[PDB]
Amino acid sequence: MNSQYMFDYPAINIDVRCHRLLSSVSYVAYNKFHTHDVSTYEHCEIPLEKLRLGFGRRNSLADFYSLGELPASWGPACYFSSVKPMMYTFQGMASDLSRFDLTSFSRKGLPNVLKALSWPLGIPDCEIFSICSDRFVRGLQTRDQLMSYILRMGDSHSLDECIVQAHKKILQEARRLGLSDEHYNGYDLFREIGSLVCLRLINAEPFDDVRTVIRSYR
């Protein structure tokens, strides 16, 4: 019963004109001893309506959602995370690319790497660099953006299932690019998304300041 208490409820508001852009999630004041279990990834509360609650500490999030469960809490904000903490590869480039708009990519006139900046959604988007920036402290006033980004690439209504599907898509992309699965846990999904997008950008760069920052790694 104590594991069911909430503080803010994610109002899943999926209007359908375009599912990849204008789907949003805003948190309202709702403790009300919520009926279902609550999972906290990074200051964001998700009700476990479809999935169940799992205990213990495992390696990755796949180890949790393979049995049909989700951990009580996991991520960088947890001192004792249910998943093993890990670092990443190309966070530096994803942070240095936080000064350009997407109009800066479209004014160049090339659609080759604009393809590469369409993995998580299919629509040309670059807000993952704004998420993975150095300034972007993950606290309050930022849950809505992260949850809307998760819902826009989830293809579902239950936020936990959207998280699981996003992690599955991350793993599928890593397998398609010949990368390992142990390099991509469920610790920080946004950083892994940014790393994959930046790797695809680096791969598509030879088909072309932005070019310098892209070719600065080899």
Binding site: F7, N31, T40, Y79, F80
Partner: protein, 284 residues
């Protein structure tokens, strides 16, 4: 990490219970927490309670963790600032520790009256609450005899007898198989508890339940002395419904409330029907 070291070092006071040390460690880690949101603090302390009950497999640790989480939720429901709310949580935790560390003395003061002059008391294993109750009773110029079982898993009965011999109280160590033999010579049974379930029963040493039955077959009074932080929202239907995290030769078992006469807590002398009322009023 280092939370287990602090929790095990807090148990350098031989009189401090495990749940009290767990609550003190939780309050210390709430004080030293650098979080800026209530959800992150709740999740971190939940995982910390998980680690603590992973270290010590007693029901009292889980009860204290659930009580601390309920207190956190209650203090968060009011202010909703997490700064003034954090100061309120700190001061309320200080007051709660100061009030809960002296509950054993109150339990003894309110329970030692039920012991007559020349009666016979039966205890199962070593517990600090029964020891304090017997000390408060012998301090009132009372004379009685004490029978204690050896508790074969870990010989706590011999330790209880050695602790009682320093109080100049006639104590006799009996075997665990001789419970039904000395049951007729005992005037009352007084046992401790590691956790009080919702309905009113207790969760205690493996040789407790079989002693509550033999007393019921002889109309012997059966009293349970336990603190308030041991109230846990559990409902075991039988001996198999007890979670394996608490039993592990089982190390613990459940006793139904129909075999319990009275409970002596810091809230007073209660019936097995008051624990459920308290747990419902708490909304744990």
């Amino acid at each position: 990490e280092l939370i287990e070291y602090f929790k095990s070092q807090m148990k350098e006071d031989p009189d401090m219970a495990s749940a009290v040390a767990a609550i003190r460690t939780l309050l210390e880690f709430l004080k030293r927490d650098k979080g800026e949101t209530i959800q992150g603090l709740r999740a971190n302390l939940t995982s910390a309670i998980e680690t603590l009950c992973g270290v010590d497999s007693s029901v009292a640790v889980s009860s204290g963790g659930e009580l601390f989480l309920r207190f956190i939720s209650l203090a968060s429901l009011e202010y909703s600032d997490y700064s003034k709310c954090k100061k309120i949580m700190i001061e309320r935790g200080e007051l709660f520790l100061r009030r809960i560390s002296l509950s054993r003395n109150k339990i003894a003061d309110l329970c030692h009256t039920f012991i007559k002059d020349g009666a016979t008391i039966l205890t199962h294993a070593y517990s600090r609450v029964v020891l304090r109750v017997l000390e408060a009773a012998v301090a009132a110029k009372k004379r009685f005899s004490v029978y204690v079982t050896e508790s074969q898993p870990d010989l706590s009965g011999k330790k209880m007898a050695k602790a009682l011999c320093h109080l100049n109280v006639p104590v006799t160590v009996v075997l665990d198989a001789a419970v039904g033999y000395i049951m007729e010579k005992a005037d009352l049974v007084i046992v401790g508890a590691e956790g009080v379930v919702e309905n009113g029963g207790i969760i205690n040493k493996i040789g407790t339940n079989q002693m509550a039955v033999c007393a019921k077959a002889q109309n012997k009074p059966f009293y349970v002395v336990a603190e308030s932080f041991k109230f846990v929202r559990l409902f075991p239907l039988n001996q198999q419904d007890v979670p394996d995290k608490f039993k592990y030769h089982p190390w613990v078992d459940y006793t139904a409330p129909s075999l319990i006469t009275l409970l002596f807590t810091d809230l007073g002398v209660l019936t097995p029907s008051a624990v459920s009322d308290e747990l419902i009023k708490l909304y744990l």
